Amino acid sequence: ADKKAILELFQTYKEPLGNYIGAEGLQRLFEDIQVDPSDVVTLVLAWKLKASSTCEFSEKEFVEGLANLQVDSLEKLKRKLSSLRKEIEDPSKFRAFYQFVFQYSKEPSQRSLPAETAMALWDVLLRGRFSLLDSWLEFLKNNTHSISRDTWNLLYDFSQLKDLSDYDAWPVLIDDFVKWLKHE
DSSP: OOHHHHHHHHHHHOOTTSSEEOHHHHHHHHHHTTOOTTSHHHHHHHHHTTOOSTTOEEHHHHHHHHHHTTOOSHHHHHHHHHHHHHHTTSHHHHHHHHHHHHHHHSOTTOSSBOHHHHHHHHHHHHTTTOTTHHHHHHHGGGOOSOBOHHHHHHHHHHHTOOTTTTOOOOOHHHHHHHHHHTTO
């Protein structure tokens, strides 16, 4: 990939400080390639770029990431996002990507993800992979604390479960959800 071309893309979208693309630049970049900011592929791109700050790419992340994706134009980036959507149909990639989203989406100083942020992301990530999603979101109306890393991670394992009926290891929020489903 032409690093010169990648660096010119960076120049186009970088923030005034010069060393990252932030929420302003990302919104313009996604507009230019006809991608909705809410689309899951924006998170898959962040995952492949090893992004360390929410809704940003540092200059290193962007330039080395596009290079690793063999992308050096906007049109090639747009097409690569279509390839990325297909890539996460692999279940081990989806698990890895799902776990990354927790880390990416919280503030570095915090250990947990705000309830509201977790729900919005679960709606984007798990719709169509988690039959009980709507019930989970409804249950959360009365469980509004921040979501821990273990709870985030194991909700995916819960979603992938006879192990169902044999539910027994699990974080308290998930155990409380199983009890809630029994109306007890």
